[PDB]
Every structure is written in C-alpha cells, then in structure tokens.
Design a protein around this ligand. Structure first.
Ligand SMILES: Nc1ncnc2c1ncn2[C@@H]1O[C@H](COP(=O)(O)OP(=O)(O)NP(=O)(O)O)[C@@H](O)[C@H]1O
Ligand SMILES: [Mg+2]
Length: 396
C-alpha cells in the first residue's frame, strides 16, 4: 500500500525481501549502486515486484534502498557468496582473452549442477549478466524441463543473451532455439531427454560457426536438480555433449567428489555454497509456477503484454503426433488443455524427434462433431501443420 521501509546496505550486503502473498512491493534505490541478480539498478527508478516475488538487491560499495508496500520478509544479509560468483565470471573472461590471443576464438562453456533449490537459475542469471556487462554475448542454455526460464515447461531451450535481464521480467526471450521434450521431468523418458540435449549441442555448435560474438561469448548451462542415480550419468553426458570446460557444483560435496574422479582432467570443477537466501519450494508451488510460465508464454508480462489469438482449426488442416518413435494421434477429448508444439519439420517424420519447434499452442476446446479444435496461439495462423503433443496441461 503506502507504508515505507528504509534500508542502509554496507558494502557487500544484500537486501533480501519477499513480497506479500496478496500485494505488490515497489523498490527504489535512493543512494549509491546496487544490482539485482546481476542487473544494475537505476537510481531513483521505481521497480514494482508482484506478489510472492523473492528478490535480493546486492551492493558492491554501499547503497540505501526504499521499499514501499507490504513484505512477508525484508532484511539485510551481510554475508553472501557474491564474490565467488564474480570470480567465476572473471575466470571465464580470462579464458576468453587468452583464446583470443591464441588466434576464430571458442569461448568457455560452463555447466551448473546441484540439487534442487540451491540458487542455480539465479547463479546462471548473474553469470550471464556479468558477461553482457563485460561486452560479451553468451548463450544461455536451459536444460530444466520443469522450471524453464526461456520457454514453456517440457522444453529444452537456448537464447543468445545480448542485454542484461530485466529486473522484473528476466532475460528477453527473443528467437530462442526450442526443443519439445513434452514432460516435466527427464525421468519420464531419459533416453529421449539425452537425445534432445545432444541435438541441442550439435545445433548450437553449427550456429556459432556463423556468429563470432556468440562463439566467443560461450555458454552458461542450467540443469535440473536430478543429481542422484540416473540423473548423475545424465550430468556426465551433458558435460560431454556440450564440451564444457568448467563445471560448477552448488552445495553438493559428494557430487563434487564423484565428478572430480570421472570428468576429463582438462575440465575445471568448482564447488561453491548456496546462498542463505535461496528459498526451498514444495511441489505445489512448483506446479503453480509452471502454470504461470505457460500463461506468460501466451500473454506476456505486466511490462510487455502479449496478445494471443484464439481460433478454430480443422482436424483436416493439422496432423497431431506424440513421441514415445513417433505415433500419429486421432484428435480426441483427451488432447484438451494440452500444449502442442508447432514442429519445424515439414512432415510427421522421423525428423520430428530431431527438429526444434516454431512455438506452442494450447488446445482449449475440442469439437468432435464439427471436427474442429480451438487453440490459443501467439500468432494469427499456425506456423506449422505438424503439431506435437506435450503432456503439460493448462487451465486458463
Ligand atoms: N540471495 C538471494 N536472496 C533472496 N532470494 C533469492 C536469493 N537467491 C535466490 N533467491 C530466490 O530463491 C528462489 C529460488 O532460486 P533459484 O535460483 O530458482 O534456485 P534453483 O536451484 O534454480 N531452483 P530449482 O531449479 O527449482 O531446483 C527464487 O525466487 C530466487 O529469486
Ligand atoms: Mg532452477
């Protein structure tokens, strides 16, 4: 509402706060310098964070910050691993220059691993932002099909980062490369998951041959939290497929010891602690968040609204298929509420499995007698006649 809280942050402190369950909180930096997960704050700009937001504003040299509205929590932390996360960037940049002097230059590729809720996504964000602030253009690769910060759930995705994340909305989602996995966990089909990220690595390697800035920018790769059992071998295959030269393990000493013995000796492995400000989720909140991600795909944000179309499509004008080999689907009541991917492949081939997607639509109604379905779509006509099933559902 109207009530105010003021905070003085010494050097190397962060204001950690969570917005209430019900209302916005607005942050304003009123003296000094501060950043939120790597993005510089502008002085006296009012940043409106929505309900449930969890945020840290960090300062290297000292800051004073005002928060307007109700907070569930808000305190200043005097100890962070931020210098750790900064020295990782410094080290990547050092590799970049040496490899520039050695010459086109191939930038460092970094894999972030660790269990759930250790601040992995936040750390990728910081590292991407610090690369941009250095003048570089890194590729952010997102292998977490549950909580994906680039596309919808059930995807493996990658974007070229050319600007710092917006403090509220995250990175711009401009022309991502997107593969439809179709499930919220790799365990649903681990062999397909591994095939998809291998196809992702192969595609990116050939893409960067046509863009030197992207090539030297390198890659920051976020993984999911499945580190045990089969998840472990999956980490090793990802390290190999993407030819990473740095693995950052967050808050897992056994995983660190195991990887140190297994990875090629040329790979640098760094164990770092999680921040004390990382919030543990539950399954319910994770589900809630997947739904909000899908909504954002179609409708956008408060800052940048997207205006999707709803229209009807004849069963005759599209072919529905499902992976798991390809199988063709006869449109039924059960496709209702499901996301489908518009495949870049021209027919319902073997090639559907290997192909990135144009984008997604949501099947909102199924008229079996009229033989038409209603879809929510980011564009006015379908970009492809090959629609690939995702097990992710969304009530809108
Ligand atoms: N230093 C911090 N202070 C306050 N909040 C933070 C901090 N670091 C992370 N968070 C918040 O904690 C939540 C979880 O962080 P996140 O970086 O998604 O962890 P994660 O390891 O990627 N989770 P998952 O991928 O679901 O296993 C997010 O809302 C962040 O904004
Ligand atoms: Mg994450």
């Amino acid at each position: 509402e109207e009530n105010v809280q003021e905070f003085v942050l010494k050097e190397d402190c962060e204001l950690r706060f969570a917005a209430g369950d019900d209302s916005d909180v607005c942050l304003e930096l009123v003296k000094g310098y501060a950043e939120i997960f790597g993005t510089e704050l502008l002085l006296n700009k009012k940043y409106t964070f929505p309900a449930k937001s969890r945020v840290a504003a960090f300062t290297w040299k000292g800051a004073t910050i005002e928060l307007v509205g109700t907070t569930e929590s808000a305190y200043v932390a005097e100890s962070t691993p931020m210098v750790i996360y900064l020295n990782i960037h410094a080290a990547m940049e050092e590799v970049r220059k040496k490899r520039e002097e050695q010459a086109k230059a191939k930038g460092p590729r970094l894999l972030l691993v660790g269990p759930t809720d250790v601040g992995k996504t936040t750390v990728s964000r910081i590292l991407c932002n610090y690369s941009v602030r250095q003048g570089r253009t890194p590729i952010f690769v997102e292998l977490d099909v549950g909580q994906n910060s680039v596309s919808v759930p059930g995807t493996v995705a990658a974007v070229l980062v050319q600007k710092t994340a917006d403090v509220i909305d995250g990175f711009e989602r401009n022309q991502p490369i997107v593969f439809n996995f179709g499930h919220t966990s790799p365990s649903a089909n681990l062999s397909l998951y591994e095939a998809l990220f291998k196809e992702m690595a192969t595609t990116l390697n050939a893409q960067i041959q046509e863009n030197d800035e992207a090539k030297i920018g390198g890659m920051i790769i976020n993984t999911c939290g499945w580190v045990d059992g089969e998840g472990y071998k999956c980490i090793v295959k990802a390290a190999s497929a993407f030819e990473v030269d740095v693995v950052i393990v967050l808050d897992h000493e056994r995983l660190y010891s195991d990887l140190s013995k297994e990875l090629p000796e040329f790979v640098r492995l760094t164990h770092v602690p999680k921040s004390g400000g990382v919030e543990q989720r539950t399954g319910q909140i994770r589900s809630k968040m997947r739904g909000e991600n899908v909504h954002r795909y179609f409708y956008g944000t408060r800052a940048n609204n997207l205006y999707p179309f709803t229209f009807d499509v004849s069963f005759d004008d599209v072919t529905l298929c499902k992976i798991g080999k390809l199988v063709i689907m006869e449109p039924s009541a059960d496709i209702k509420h499901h996301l489908f991917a518009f495949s870049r492949s021209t027919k319902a081939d073997e090639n559907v499995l290997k192909s990135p997607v144009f984008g997604f639509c949501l099947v909102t109604e199924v008229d079996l007698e009229k033989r038409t379905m209603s879809i929510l779509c980011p564009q006015r006509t379908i970009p492809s006649k090959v629609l690939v099933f995702s097990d992710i559902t969304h009530l809108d």
